[PDB]
């Protein structure tokens, strides 16, 4: 493995006055960028969806659903409130083999249409980061997609590390 290095956290803005209640519900992954994300023209990445449910204790149950091998695949994360509102750590990190580190920062959102979220983790001592462009719908404007490309490039990622998953109906319409 050779990886583009994680950016310093100083280059990753935090959404001011983060509203945890308004960030809840279903988000479509309209854009994906990161040091382990590679464009694949033979088999282009399919859109998946992530559901944020705020618990009584103010941590998030995070359920993601993707269409793989004719079936809906579910995976669950717990996001624990971090240092400042809009940051999170991963609950029960010991239950993920090789994972020593996991950070979430909500970069920007208007809550009812779009969000950009930064993830950083250390797995088998390798440092991974990604940015997801979230949509409340499966389509976003040229403007929001160019904003996400610009932001991804500001963190050192070239074009072939930025993908726009293809909209689908299976699994993610529930």
Residue numbers in the entry: 5 to 178
Quote the paper.
P. aeruginosa produces two chemically-distinct siderophores, pyoverdine (PVD) and PCH, with relatively high or low affinities for iron, respectively. We had previously shown that Scn does not appreciably bind to PVD or PCH in qualitative binding assays, and does not arrest the growth of P. aeruginosa in vitro, suggesting that Scn does not efficiently sequester one or both siderophores. The quite large PVD structure would also not be expected to fit within the Scn calyx, nor would the structure of PCH-chelated iron be expected to fit within the key binding pocket, due to tight steric constraints around the iron center imposed by K125 and K134. A preliminary crystal structure of a Scn/PCH complex (3U03.pdb) was deposited in the Protein Databank (PDB,) by a structural genomics consortium. However, examination of this structure revealed a number of concerns. First, using the deposited diffraction data, it was readily apparent that the PCH ligand as modeled sat in negative electron density in difference Fourier syntheses. Second, this particular crystal form of Scn usually contains three molecules in the asymmetric unit, though only two had been modeled in the deposited structure. Using the deposited diffraction data, we re-refined the structure, successfully placing the third Scn molecule and improving refinement statistics: Rfree/Rwork values decreased from 0.303/0.269 (3U03.pdb) to 0.253/0.235. Calyx electron density features in the re-refined structure were inconsistent with bound Fe-PCH but were consistent with a bound sulfate ion comparable to those observed in apo-Scn structures crystallized from ammonium sulfate, and in the phenylurea complex. We concluded that Scn does not bind PCH, at least under these crystallization conditions, in concordance with prior results.
